[PDB]
Design a protein around this ligand. Structure first.
Ligand SMILES: [Ca+2]
Ligand SMILES: [Ca+2]
Ligand SMILES: [Ca+2]
Ligand SMILES: [Ca+2]
Ligand SMILES: [Ca+2]
Length: 347
């Protein structure tokens, strides 16, 4: 006799469409967090005649859950008899409960129950409740300092394959992009990470200079819109290019020697500078021409001395063209020239 609202007319008839009220419940959230459970549309039954006039208070209607499936619903739900307010009693685990289908009873309390019934369907919702994660505990990358902007960080010294950063999330099914946001905690003006895909890569925003900074250490944090991952730590090694030339302090050197000096005496100590790494910075000194057999230089020290079995003479002048070269492979080798002007003087 009472009718649930709304009465949706069945066209070409005078009948109300049977109602199935709808509710949805986020898995694992507490009654405190969720109550009261919002029902769409709101549950409500009214009386037909007499109540042609303003009902105001005291509807005289009692609500209850008549029956439901699965049968443990009483464990999770309670309905208030007068207000039909739906209360969750315990958090719901979707692994065990995906849905409930209940039957709602509405009857009068005057002693003459003429029950009415309606459906109530309750979905248990999956939620973004798993933190994203990286599939490696850390990441080691390599980049050649001569790499241009846009270059991809490599995962080995060979620089043959890109550094792969895989960020997953258990809320997202396999082989599907979890659409995570990745935060870098440092060097965001130097490196950037690709912004889509299950596998991410690191590329250069700015060129890097090994001679300026040879290593970068920072951490990446994934974010799914709700929870962050643990930060994962990253080290990037900048690899040396032979992009520095062995350099003398000056273009030419004026030096005087003396007649009483003999084989094995320091004439001048030349020192060139190469900031590159290892053999790329390893300098070799050579007199190309001009010594006339009277002077030699130490290949590794750069010290010029008197040649063996050689005696100075008073007026003699020399123009030594001295080369400093690094020990990179010939294809990448760099060098520069210093001219040493030597003049013999009396003591
Ligand atoms: Ca989930
Ligand atoms: Ca998630
Ligand atoms: Ca450099
Ligand atoms: Ca060099
Ligand atoms: Ca270099």
């Amino acid at each position: 006799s009472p009718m649930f609202l709304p009465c949706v007319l069945v066209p070409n008839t005078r009948d109300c469409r049977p109602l199935t009220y709808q509710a949805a419940i986020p898995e694992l959230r507490t009654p405190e967090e969720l109550n009261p459970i919002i029902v769409t549309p709101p549950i409500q039954a009214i009386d037909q005649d007499r109540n042609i006039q303003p009902p105001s208070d005291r509807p005289g209607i009692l609500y209850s859950i008549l029956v439901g499936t699965p049968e443990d619903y009483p464990r999770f739900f309670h309905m208030h008899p007068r207000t039909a307010e739906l209360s969750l009693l315990e958090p719901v685990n979707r692994d065990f409960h995906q849905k409930f289908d209940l039957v709602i009873k509405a009857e009068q309390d005057n002693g003459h129950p003429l029950p009415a019934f309606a459906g109530l369907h309750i979905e248990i919702l999956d939620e973004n409740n798993q933190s994203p994660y990286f599939t490696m505990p850390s990441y080691q990358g390599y980049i050649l300092e001569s790499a241009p902007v846009g270059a991809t960080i490599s995962d080995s010294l060979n620089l043959t394959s890109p550094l792969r950063i895989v960020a997953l999330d258990k809320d997202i099914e396999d082989t599907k992009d979890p659409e995570l946001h990745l935060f870098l905690n440092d060097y965001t003006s130097v490196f950037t990470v690709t912004q889509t895909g299950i596998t991410r890569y690191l590329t250069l925003l700015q060129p890097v200079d090994r001679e300026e900074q040879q290593t970068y250490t920072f951490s990446i944090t994934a974010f799914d819109g709700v929870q962050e991952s643990e930060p994962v730590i990253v080290n990037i090694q900048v690899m040396d290019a032979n992009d520095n030339t062995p350099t003398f302090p000056e273009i030419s050197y004026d030096v005087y020697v003396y007649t009483d000096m003999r084989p094995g005496d320091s004439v001048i100590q030349l020192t060139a500078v190469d900031a590159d790494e290892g053999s790329n910075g390893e300098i070799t000194y050579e007199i190309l021409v001009g010594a006339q057999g009277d002077f030699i230089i130490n290949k590794t020290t750069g010290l010029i001395t008197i040649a063996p079995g050689v005696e100075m003479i008073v007026g003699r002048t020399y123009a030594l063209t001295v080369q400093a070269a690094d020990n990179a492979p010939p294809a990448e080798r760099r060098n520069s020239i210093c001219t040493v002007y030597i003049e013999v003087l009396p003591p």
